[PDB]
Design a protein around this ligand. Sequence first.
Ligand code: HEA
Ligand code: HEA
Ligand code: CUA
Ligand SMILES: [Ca+2]
Ligand SMILES: [Cu+2]
Ligand SMILES: [Mg+2]
Lengths: 59, 534, 99, 236, 50, 269, 75, 51
Amino acid sequence: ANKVIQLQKIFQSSTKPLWWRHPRSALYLYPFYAIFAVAVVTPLLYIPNAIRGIKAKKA
Amino acid sequence: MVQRWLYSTNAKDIAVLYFMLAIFSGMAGTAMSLIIRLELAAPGSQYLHGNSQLFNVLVVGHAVLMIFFLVMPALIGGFGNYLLPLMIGATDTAFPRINNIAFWVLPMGLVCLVTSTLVESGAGTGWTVYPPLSSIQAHSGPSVDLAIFALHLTSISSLLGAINFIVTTLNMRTNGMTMHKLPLFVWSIFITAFLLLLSLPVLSAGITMLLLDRNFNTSFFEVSGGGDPILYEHLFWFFGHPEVYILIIPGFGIISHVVSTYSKKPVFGEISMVYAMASIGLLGFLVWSHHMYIVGLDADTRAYFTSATMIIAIPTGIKIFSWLATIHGGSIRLATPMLYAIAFLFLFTMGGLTGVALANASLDVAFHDTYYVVGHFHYVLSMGAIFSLFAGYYYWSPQILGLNYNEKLAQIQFWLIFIGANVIFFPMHFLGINGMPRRIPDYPDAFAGWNYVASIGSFIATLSLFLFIYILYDQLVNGLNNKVNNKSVIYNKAPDFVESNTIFNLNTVKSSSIEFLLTSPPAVHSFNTPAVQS
Amino acid sequence: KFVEGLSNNKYKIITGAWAASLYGSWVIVNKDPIMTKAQKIVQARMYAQFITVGLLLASVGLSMYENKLHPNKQKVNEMRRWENALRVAEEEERLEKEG
Amino acid sequence: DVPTPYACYFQDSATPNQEGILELHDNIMFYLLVILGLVSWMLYTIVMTYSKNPIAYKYIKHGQTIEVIWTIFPAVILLIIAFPSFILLYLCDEVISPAMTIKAIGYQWYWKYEYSDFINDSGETVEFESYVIPDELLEEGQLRLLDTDTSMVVPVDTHIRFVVTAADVIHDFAIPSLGIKVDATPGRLNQVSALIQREGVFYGACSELCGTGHANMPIKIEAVSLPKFLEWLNEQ
Amino acid sequence: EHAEHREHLKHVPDSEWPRDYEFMNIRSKPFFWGDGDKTLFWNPVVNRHI
Amino acid sequence: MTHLERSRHQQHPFHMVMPSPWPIVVSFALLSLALSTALTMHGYIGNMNMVYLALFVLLTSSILWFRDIVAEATYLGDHTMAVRKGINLGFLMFVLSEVLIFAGLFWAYFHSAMSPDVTLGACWPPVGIEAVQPTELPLLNTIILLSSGATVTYSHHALIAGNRNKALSGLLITFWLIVIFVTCQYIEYTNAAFTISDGVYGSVFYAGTGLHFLHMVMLAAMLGVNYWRMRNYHLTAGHHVGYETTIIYTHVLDVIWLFLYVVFYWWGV
Amino acid sequence: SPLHTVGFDARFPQQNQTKHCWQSYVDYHKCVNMKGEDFAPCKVFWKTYNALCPLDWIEKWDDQREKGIFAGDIN
Amino acid sequence: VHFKDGVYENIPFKVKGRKTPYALSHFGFFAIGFAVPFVACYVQLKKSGAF
Ligand code: HEA
Ligand code: HEA
Ligand code: CUA
Ligand SMILES: [Ca+2]
Ligand SMILES: [Cu+2]
Ligand SMILES: [Mg+2]
């Protein structure tokens, strides 16, 4: 609803990093770090079974 | 410390991350070549207990690491991202987050290539991963998939960096620099980025086709189903010859800088060098089937391809004659980059002459998949591109690091690698002309005689690499003292014959590019106000 | 008469006609310049492929103008190829029997 | 016919193709040695007379009357080395009136040969697989990684046509002294010709990476006179 | 007139189906999802692997 | 302006981007995607939850990168004329790379079709394969693409002409026509006789038009974000470069769909 | 000499000869419906396909013509 | 961000003021790279029963 001047006055007069300057940034950024932290380390846990040759249980 | 190096957005930091990864992966590929060459030293199983699959996996790792993880991120990734903004007067590259992801997708390609080695048996297929060997019948398991993903992440890096380079030198040149007044290294990175942009799509298409063939039951190159592996050979080598001209064109730029600054006279006919590089890049797309002379083409196909493969000897000959003309009549200052440049000018021409021996499809039936081809390309690779890479390091390292290297140790290192590389790669022509095939872990006993001397030369080459590691250590620790004592060359240009030692002191550097005028180690904000040129 | 003689040059004339329509409409869209070059390219191309798809449905119109000439091809000159490949085996069988 | 230790030249020719390949290679190597002597002499004399030169002729940049010469002269030497190459290329492709066909099918780490002409009194097609003699069962005097248990026997002074294909992966039917190198891909049939000029035995190997048995995949061709070929074919 | 052709094709069981040619329904390894032979847009009326 | 006040700005027109985490985050997401798909393709991981998580993380990290680009371009005023020219040139080099991917795929189709095999029967389309006829639904798919370009052209020129309702409505019509095309391609893929496993024909056909399908679903996404930014007044009458890149993208997907049409549906039947 | 072989053919005088053996096979098997038994020149096709086409392919194609999966027109 | 200038501030690794010797970091950076194919060789030979 044309908040662009009001958002310019926040994004320019701010100290926080650019991905944190919006008021709603804590709603995006805090779940994403948890989802990212499991998404990058769960294949690394399956790397040793793939080296040993152990397939997962499907039946 | 995490924002400067993990969240990085300046090109001069991403360049040294590229350089650290490049020299790490070059240590990896040199270790792999030492294992290959140690197994090849004598007939019979020597060090790997039989197990020719492990030999083939090591050959794959050696080729992929040395091409896509040493020479490309060294030359393009380090030297282009560092020097092209500094030599066109740009404050940074255009699109810098792209420039950061084009580095950080390379350790991920490295870890997936290493676990490609560690899963079931590795992908022993050659670096040209040909089906049906690279299929799911002949290579069961996740090895080849992870190798294909390594190639995908490296192609993502070298495509994003190519877009970055093209735009940042078409758009961010400083305010006197027309396109005709560019340095030759900038033209090198420019033409290389176009070759990357035009060639990496077809490779990505071909190896995604292979990946879908392996895992998604589709049949692009499956014969029982309607495929053809010659389609893979076409789609691969349409990238594969532009790839090897990509590997050599920044080397041409580095040599044209080094030769001119150590001959103390400008390059003979600079715009013809630009035209020659552009002609090599254009004609490199028209020659791709000289790697396919045996597969069963027509005679007129092979006649055109000998003609087109032959007529690229003209611009490379123009470049090499221009290098001889720009050292003729000079005042040669025999420093380590000059030694590497003269060794380039000899050994690259020997590799190119064996290349025009290979260009004749009439004759390539005697040399295909022999060690003669291995001799040609290891000449023009490990004595063209590696020698120009060493020349670029010894040419730019004290400027962009702030620390000088030991000059005597550098010349010892040069003479050891120049001896050792010749001793590896010169008998390979004898083996290949007598009929020794490629990619074999074991050979008939009549090939033992030159194989032994080649693997003796391998130890000279890796000894000079270990000496280079010590040269890096001595530069990083004692590099401020090498300026004080007489262990290093401080000025790469001597005074002219009537120039006083005091009149030299007001004009210590006499360069035709901005790189040697900057502050040593250059500022985080170079070019606050823009540089200006008539 | 002329109809199949340039109806097997069918997908080699329509791409040339596309190139003709774009690179011909280019001068008519570029003769009045105030738009940027990209808008001229997209409007000339927008006209040109309306032309090629209209000409392509005229292509299928010609395709069934034209093979009430001789019915049931895609095999009646595999007939030709197989018929004379047959009796060129005949021309060899005889004078190796009598030669 | 066989590699020798410390060799540096081709194996001894046995077909007109290989003896033409040798002459084209030497004709190319002639002008290649001219160019190598030129650029190595310049690279020697320049750094040995201008390393000790203290005044650099820094105003030599153009050279118009000689840039055209070193553009033109590589082109005419390309033309000179390209004149016999085209003649050999258009001579080696014709397979005109051969007196024998032989199919060679590369399986994974054996070759399978198939004489298919029914010139026999048996009238049936002759096929056999030729495996490498393994290192533990080599009887004394045999050539390691070259000798096989069965052999491909061919008459001399006979135009032979090799039709080459594969079964699973890409192989390469290659014999250097006969001068044939032909890719066996699992979809198609290539052909080469040969005329063996002298009797003997000629070795070759798979020159295409087949997998883990790639080094253990040799070719052995015994060329005999036509009586002895016939009496060999009468058994197998 | 194609939905009605699928309507009358729903009444033709698989022994009355035409036998697949050699290149049809390549099965190198089973697909890693689902039940094996079914692909991503496998409509079981128009597609059948017997 | 004075020297004292000119010294408080940049002296050169180029964007010095602040340090950002999304390069290394997207790089680790591509790592997790590669390592997850290479292990679920071979059964070392039970289900597709790791691949789903990896693709979701990849998409959201790209979205946060694009959010920061929108923030730089709109709320900080960092995109000058030189930066605009550079972004347009980078997008043009990008679409040239993707046209070359499609040229490789067309090479695959032509190498299979110019002289086909003997295992299909020296035939194209192969025996038993019921080819998609070019008259029924793909003709409507060409029509709703040539019309989508005509809608986005007046939407663009009405964005320049000061109109708001005539540009938003044209953008909405363009977006809905693109999703009409995507649902029609889904309907064709369901009611197609051959599958992707049905030989080299199904391979090359679904490869080409499925890559076009993926480019069209990304086109629908960027038309949606352009509608969002035009409704919320981010796009202006003189500075709309993401909109311009989307227009370039529509008009190259149009011509490569035409090449796919006349090759895969007319010459190849 | 009793040695006789397929000569080169003007339809296929290049290096690849896949459509020599496949064409002579489909020409032989589409003789014997239109031609029939004991016909003297359909052994020209027989010598041509069995001299240069490999045994795996011949038995695969004969199996496919008993299937109804042969991709030629011999009925 | 404004970053530090100077001689040793352009490298991600520490050289001068360290509680450990630098040659540790320097030569263990390269010995790991020289030792990846030996780890590769060891595991693909233990998988093939040669050890
Ligand atoms: C970048 C190209 C490159 C380089 C430099 C090398 C270097 C070497 N290579 Fe090889 N090689 C290939 C590319 C290269 N190779 C390719 C493409 C294949 C084909 C694979 C296939 O057939 O599928 C191959 C295959 C190949 C074969 C054929 C084996 C086979 O066919 O299976 C052999 C033979 O022994 C070999 C050995 C060597 C040896 C002993 C070196 C030695 O020269 C190593 C000595 C070199 C150095 C010591 C360089 C310095 C090291 C650095 C790290 C530079 C650092 C400097 C800076 C960072 C400024 N490699
Ligand atoms: C550094 C990269 C690089 C460069 C620059 C070259 C340069 C050339 N190469 Fe090479 N080549 C490779 C990398 C490179 N190559 C690789 C990696 C392979 C193997 C891939 C694989 O199989 O795995 C290969 C293999 C390869 C083949 C395939 C053979 C086979 O696989 O069977 C051919 C065929 O023509 C070829 C020829 C040439 C020619 C004609 C040049 C020319 O550009 C050289 C031009 C230079 C000169 C000619 C010398 C200087 C000129 C003069 C002094 C003027 C006077 C001379 C004349 C007039 C002749 N090389
Ligand atoms: Cu058969 Cu290598
Ligand atoms: Ca050995
Ligand atoms: Cu090449
Ligand atoms: Mg080969």
